[PDB]
Coordinates of C-alpha atoms and ligand atoms in Angstrom, one line a residue:
X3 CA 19.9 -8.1 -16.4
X4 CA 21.0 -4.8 -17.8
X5 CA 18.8 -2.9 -15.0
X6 CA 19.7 -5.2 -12.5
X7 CA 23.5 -3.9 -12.8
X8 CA 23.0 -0.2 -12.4
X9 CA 20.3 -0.6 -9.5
X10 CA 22.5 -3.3 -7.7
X11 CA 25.9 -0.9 -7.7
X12 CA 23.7 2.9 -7.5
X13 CA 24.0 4.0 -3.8
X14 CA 20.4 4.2 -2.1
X15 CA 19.7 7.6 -0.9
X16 CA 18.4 8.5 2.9
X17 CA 15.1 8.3 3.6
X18 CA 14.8 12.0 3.9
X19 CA 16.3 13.1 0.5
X20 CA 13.9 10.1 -0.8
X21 CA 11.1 12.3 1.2
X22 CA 9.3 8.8 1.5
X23 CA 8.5 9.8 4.8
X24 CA 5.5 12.4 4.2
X25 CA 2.1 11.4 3.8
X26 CA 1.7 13.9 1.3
X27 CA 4.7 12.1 -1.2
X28 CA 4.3 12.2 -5.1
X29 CA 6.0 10.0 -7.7
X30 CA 5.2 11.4 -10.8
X31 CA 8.9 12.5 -11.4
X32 CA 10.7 9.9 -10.3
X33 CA 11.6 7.6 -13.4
X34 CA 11.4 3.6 -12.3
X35 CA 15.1 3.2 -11.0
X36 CA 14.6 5.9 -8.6
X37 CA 11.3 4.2 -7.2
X38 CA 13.6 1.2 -7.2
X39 CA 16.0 3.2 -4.7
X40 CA 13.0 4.3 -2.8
X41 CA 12.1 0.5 -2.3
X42 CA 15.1 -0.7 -1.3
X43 CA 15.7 2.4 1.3
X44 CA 12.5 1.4 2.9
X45 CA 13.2 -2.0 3.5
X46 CA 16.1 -0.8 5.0
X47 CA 14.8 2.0 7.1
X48 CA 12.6 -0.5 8.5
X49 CA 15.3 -2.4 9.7
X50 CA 14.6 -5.2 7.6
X51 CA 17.5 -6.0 5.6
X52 CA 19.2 -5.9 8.9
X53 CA 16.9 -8.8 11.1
X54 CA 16.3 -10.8 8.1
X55 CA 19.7 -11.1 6.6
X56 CA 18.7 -10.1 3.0
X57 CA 21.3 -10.1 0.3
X58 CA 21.5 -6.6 -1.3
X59 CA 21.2 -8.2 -4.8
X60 CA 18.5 -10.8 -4.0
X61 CA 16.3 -7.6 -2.9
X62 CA 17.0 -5.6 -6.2
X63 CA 16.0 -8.5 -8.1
X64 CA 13.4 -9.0 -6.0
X65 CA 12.1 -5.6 -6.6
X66 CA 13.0 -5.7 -10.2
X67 CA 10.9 -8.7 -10.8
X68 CA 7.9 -6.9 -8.4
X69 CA 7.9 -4.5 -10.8
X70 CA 8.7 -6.7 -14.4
X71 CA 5.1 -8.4 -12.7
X72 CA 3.4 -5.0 -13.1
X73 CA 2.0 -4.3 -16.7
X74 CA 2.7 -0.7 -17.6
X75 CA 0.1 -1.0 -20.2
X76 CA -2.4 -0.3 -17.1
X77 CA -3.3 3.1 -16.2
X78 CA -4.0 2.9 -12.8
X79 CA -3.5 -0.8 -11.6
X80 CA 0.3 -0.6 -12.1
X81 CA 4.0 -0.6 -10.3
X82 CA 3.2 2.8 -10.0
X83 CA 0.1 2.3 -7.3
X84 CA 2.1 -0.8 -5.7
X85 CA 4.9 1.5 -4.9
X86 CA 2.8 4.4 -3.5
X87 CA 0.9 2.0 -1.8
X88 CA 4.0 0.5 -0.1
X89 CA 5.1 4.5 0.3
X90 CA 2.1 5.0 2.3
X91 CA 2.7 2.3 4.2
X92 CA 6.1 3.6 5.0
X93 CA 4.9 6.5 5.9
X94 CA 2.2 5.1 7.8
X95 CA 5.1 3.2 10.1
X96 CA 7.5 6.0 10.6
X97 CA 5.5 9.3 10.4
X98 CA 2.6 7.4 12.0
X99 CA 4.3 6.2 15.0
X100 CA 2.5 2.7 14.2
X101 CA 6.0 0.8 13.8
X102 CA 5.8 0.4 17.7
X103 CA 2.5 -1.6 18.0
X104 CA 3.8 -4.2 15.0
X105 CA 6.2 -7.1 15.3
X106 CA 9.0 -7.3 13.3
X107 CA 7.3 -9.9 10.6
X108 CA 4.2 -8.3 10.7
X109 CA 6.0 -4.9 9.5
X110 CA 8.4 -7.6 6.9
X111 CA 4.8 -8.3 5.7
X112 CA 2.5 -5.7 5.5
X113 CA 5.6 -4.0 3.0
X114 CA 6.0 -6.9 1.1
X115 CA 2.0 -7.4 0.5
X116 CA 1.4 -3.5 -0.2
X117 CA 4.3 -4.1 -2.7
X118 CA 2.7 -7.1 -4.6
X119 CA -1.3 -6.7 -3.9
X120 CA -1.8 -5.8 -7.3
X121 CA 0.6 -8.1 -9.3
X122 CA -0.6 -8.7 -12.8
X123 CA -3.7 -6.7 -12.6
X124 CA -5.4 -6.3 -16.0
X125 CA -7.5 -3.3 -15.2
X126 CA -10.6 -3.9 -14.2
X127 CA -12.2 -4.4 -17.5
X128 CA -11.4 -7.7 -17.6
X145 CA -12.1 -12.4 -3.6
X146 CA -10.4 -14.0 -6.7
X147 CA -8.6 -11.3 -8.3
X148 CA -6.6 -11.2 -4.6
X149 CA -6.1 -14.3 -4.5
X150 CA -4.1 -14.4 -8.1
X151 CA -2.4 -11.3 -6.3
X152 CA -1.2 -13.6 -4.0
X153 CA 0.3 -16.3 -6.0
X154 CA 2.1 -13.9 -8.4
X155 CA 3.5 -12.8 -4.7
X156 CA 4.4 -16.3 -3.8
X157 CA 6.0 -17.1 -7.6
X158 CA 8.3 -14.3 -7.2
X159 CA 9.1 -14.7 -3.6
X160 CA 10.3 -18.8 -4.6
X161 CA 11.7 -17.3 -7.7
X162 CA 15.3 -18.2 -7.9
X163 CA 17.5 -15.2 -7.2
X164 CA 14.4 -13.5 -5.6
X165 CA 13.9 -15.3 -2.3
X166 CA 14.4 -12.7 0.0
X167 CA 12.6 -14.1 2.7
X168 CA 15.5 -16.9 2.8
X169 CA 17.0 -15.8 6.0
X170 CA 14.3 -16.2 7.9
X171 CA 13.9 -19.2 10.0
X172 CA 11.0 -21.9 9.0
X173 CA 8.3 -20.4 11.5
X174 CA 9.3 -16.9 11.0
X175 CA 8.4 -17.8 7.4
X176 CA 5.6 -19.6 8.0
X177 CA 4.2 -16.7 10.2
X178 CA 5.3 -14.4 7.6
X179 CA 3.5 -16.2 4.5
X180 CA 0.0 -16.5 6.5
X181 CA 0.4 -12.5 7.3
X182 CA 1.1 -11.6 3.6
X183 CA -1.9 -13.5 2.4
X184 CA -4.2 -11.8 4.7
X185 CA -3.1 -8.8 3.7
X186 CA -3.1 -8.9 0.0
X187 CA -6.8 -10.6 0.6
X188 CA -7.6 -7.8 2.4
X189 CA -6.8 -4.9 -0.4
X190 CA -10.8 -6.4 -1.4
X191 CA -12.8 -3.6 -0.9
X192 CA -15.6 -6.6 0.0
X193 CA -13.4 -8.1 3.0
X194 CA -13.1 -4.4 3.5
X195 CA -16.7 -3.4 4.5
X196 CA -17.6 -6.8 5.6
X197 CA -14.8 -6.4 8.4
X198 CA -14.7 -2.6 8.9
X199 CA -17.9 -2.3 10.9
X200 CA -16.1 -4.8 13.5
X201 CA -12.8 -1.8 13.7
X202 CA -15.1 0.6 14.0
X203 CA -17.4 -0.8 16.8
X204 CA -14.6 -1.2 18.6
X205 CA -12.6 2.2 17.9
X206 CA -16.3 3.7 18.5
X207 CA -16.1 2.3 22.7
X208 CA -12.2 2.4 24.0
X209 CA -12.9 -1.4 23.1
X210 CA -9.9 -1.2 20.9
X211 CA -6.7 -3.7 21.8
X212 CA -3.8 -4.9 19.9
X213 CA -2.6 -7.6 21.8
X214 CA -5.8 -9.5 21.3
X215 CA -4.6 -11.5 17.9
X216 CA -8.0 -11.1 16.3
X217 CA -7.9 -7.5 16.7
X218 CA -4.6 -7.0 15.5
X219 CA -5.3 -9.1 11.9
X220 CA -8.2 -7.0 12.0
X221 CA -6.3 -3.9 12.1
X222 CA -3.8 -5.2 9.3
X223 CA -6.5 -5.5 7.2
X224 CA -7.7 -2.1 7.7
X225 CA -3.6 -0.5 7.7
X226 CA -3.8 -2.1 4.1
X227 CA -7.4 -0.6 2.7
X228 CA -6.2 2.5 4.0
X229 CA -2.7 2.5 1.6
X230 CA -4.5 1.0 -1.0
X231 CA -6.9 3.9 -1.2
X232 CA -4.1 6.6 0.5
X233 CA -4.5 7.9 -3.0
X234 CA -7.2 10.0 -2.4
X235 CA -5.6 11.6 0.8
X236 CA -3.3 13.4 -1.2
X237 CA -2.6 16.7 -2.0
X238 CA -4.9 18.4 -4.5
X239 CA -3.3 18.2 -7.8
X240 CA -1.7 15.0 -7.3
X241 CA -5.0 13.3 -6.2
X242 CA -6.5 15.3 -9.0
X243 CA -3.8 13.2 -11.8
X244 CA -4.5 9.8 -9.7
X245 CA -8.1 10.2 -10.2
X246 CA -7.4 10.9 -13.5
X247 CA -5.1 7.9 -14.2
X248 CA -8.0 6.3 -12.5
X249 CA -10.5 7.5 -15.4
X250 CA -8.2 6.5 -17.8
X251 CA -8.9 2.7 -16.8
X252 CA -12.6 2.6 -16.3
X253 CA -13.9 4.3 -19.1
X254 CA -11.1 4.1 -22.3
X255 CA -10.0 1.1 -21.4
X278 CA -20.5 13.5 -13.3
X279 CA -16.5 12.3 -11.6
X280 CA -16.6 15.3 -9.0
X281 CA -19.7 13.3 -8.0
X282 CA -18.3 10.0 -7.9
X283 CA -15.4 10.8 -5.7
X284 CA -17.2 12.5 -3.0
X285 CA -19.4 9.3 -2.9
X286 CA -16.4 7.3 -2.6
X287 CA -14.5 9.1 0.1
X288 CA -18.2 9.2 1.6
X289 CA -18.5 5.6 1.5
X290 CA -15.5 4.4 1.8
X291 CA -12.3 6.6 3.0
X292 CA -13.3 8.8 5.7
X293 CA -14.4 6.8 8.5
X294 CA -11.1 4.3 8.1
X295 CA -9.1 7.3 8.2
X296 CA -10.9 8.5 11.0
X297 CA -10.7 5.5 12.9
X298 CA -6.7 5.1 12.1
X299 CA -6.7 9.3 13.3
X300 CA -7.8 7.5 16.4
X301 CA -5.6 5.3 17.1
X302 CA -2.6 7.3 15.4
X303 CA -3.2 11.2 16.0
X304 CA -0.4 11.3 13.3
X305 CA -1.7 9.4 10.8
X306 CA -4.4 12.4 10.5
X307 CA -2.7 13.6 7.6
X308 CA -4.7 11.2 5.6
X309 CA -7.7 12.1 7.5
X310 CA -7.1 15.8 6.7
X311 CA -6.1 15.3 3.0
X312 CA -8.9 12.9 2.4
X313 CA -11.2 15.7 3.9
X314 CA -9.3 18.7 1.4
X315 CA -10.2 16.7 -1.5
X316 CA -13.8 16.2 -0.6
X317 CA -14.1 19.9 -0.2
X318 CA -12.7 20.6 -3.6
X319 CA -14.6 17.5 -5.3
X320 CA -17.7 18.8 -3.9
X321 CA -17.2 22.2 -5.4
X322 CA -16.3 20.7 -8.5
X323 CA -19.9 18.4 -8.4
X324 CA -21.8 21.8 -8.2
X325 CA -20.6 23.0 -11.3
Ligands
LIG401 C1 -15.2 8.0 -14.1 O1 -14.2 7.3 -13.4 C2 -14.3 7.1 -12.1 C3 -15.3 6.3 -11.5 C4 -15.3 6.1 -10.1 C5 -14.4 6.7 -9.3 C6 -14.4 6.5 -7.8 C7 -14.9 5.1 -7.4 C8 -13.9 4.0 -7.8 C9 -12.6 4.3 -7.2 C10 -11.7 3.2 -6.9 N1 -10.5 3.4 -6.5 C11 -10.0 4.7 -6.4 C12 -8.6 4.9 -6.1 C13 -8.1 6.1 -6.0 C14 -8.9 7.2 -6.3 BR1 -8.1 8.9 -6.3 C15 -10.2 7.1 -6.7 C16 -10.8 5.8 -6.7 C17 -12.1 5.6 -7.1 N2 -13.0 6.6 -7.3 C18 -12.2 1.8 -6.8 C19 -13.7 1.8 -6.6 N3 -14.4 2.6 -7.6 C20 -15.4 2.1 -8.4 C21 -15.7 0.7 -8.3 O2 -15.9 2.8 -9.2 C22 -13.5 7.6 -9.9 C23 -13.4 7.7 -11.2 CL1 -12.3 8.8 -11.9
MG402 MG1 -7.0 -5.3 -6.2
ZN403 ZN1 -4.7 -1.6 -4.9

């Protein structure tokens, strides 16, 4: 309740002095009030605190408790990756020109899942680890003091609930490759349409995957200290090899599907592709 008093009065800085706009953002020296700040301004930025009547002090609790919900005790699996994943997703919306092709609750959503699709993660020496995701997002959410989805009506809600579990259920890199070959037939032939509703929960599952992963689309020595937090989980508790593998795999064609349908979300196609480069000369010795 201490921290609650100096985040609820501090005033929360533009986007633009936040720099949460670029694709290629960093966190590292931040301390976790100012990524509290950072929250709160997107939300706002967003225009969410305006449509859905949020309280200013429901929100800093809310985030508060978001991140109270994170254990710091995890390398990689922390506030710290919910945060940049919601970031990214911020960045995605504004610098991406995608807020346009989202309604207002699917934006409310999409932030508030890439916020809390990692709640209580252990680390993953210890899709049902979503799916606990998910309730820790729903606890919090009917916390007392927390709700700040209260001024929304009881179908904006309900539309808003279903739309947050997808998407934290869709941060499983299984759901990810089972579904991804279904974007990227239909990237692959002008077959590609929003307004179909399949397509479009489709796509929100893919907007997710790629924040989740947005890591590795970073600039060089900032992906270089992710992938090293990420190291820091696996093994305590050869990699130059692993992570082209990975972007090979995994990254590069979602980012080149989202570079198609966002030209200016190629920044994470690019800085995917500049890592790759340098983990591949690091894989020859
Ligand atoms: C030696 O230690 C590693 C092992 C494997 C890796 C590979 C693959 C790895 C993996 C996963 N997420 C990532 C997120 C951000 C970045 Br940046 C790299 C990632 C990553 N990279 C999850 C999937 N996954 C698995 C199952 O192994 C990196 C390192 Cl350091
Ligand atoms: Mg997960
Ligand atoms: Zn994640």
């Amino acid at each position: 309740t201490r921290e609650l008093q100096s985040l609820a009065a501090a005033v929360v800085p533009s986007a633009q002095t936040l720099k949460i706009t670029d694709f290629s953002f960093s966190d590292f020296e931040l301390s976790d009030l100012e990524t509290a700040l950072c929250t709160i301004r997107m939300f706002t930025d967003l225009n969410l605190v305006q449509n859905f009547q949020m309280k200013h002090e429901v929100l800093c609790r809310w985030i508060l408790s978001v991140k109270k919900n994170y254990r710091k005790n995890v390398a990689y699996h922390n506030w710290r990756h919910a945060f940049n994943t919601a970031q990214c997703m911020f960045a995605a919306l504004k610098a991406g020109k995608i807020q346009n092709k989202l309604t207002d609750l699917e934006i409310l959503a999409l932030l508030i899942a890439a916020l809390s699709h990692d709640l209580d993660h252990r680390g993953v020496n210890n899709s049902i680890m979503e799916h606990h995701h998910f309730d820790q997002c729903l606890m919090i959410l009917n916390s007392p003091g927390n709700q700040i989805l209260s001024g929304l009506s009881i179908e904006e809600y309900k539309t808003t609930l279903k739309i947050i579990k997808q998407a934290i259920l869709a941060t499983d890199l299984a759901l990810y490759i089972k579904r991804r070959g279904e974007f990227f037939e239909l990237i692959r032939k002008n077959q590609f349409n929003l307004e179909d509703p399949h397509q479009k929960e489709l796509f929100l599952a893919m907007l997710m995957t790629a924040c989740d992963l947005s890591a590795i689309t970073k600039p060089w020595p900032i992906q270089q200290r992710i992938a090293e937090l990420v190291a820091t989980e696996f093994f305590d508790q050869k990699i130059p090899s692993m992570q082209v593998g990975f972007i090979d795999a995994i990254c590069l064609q979602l980012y080149e599907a989202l570079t198609h349908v966002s030209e200016d979300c190629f920044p994470l196609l690019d800085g995917c592709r500049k890592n790759r480069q340098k983990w591949q000369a690091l894989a020859e010795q």
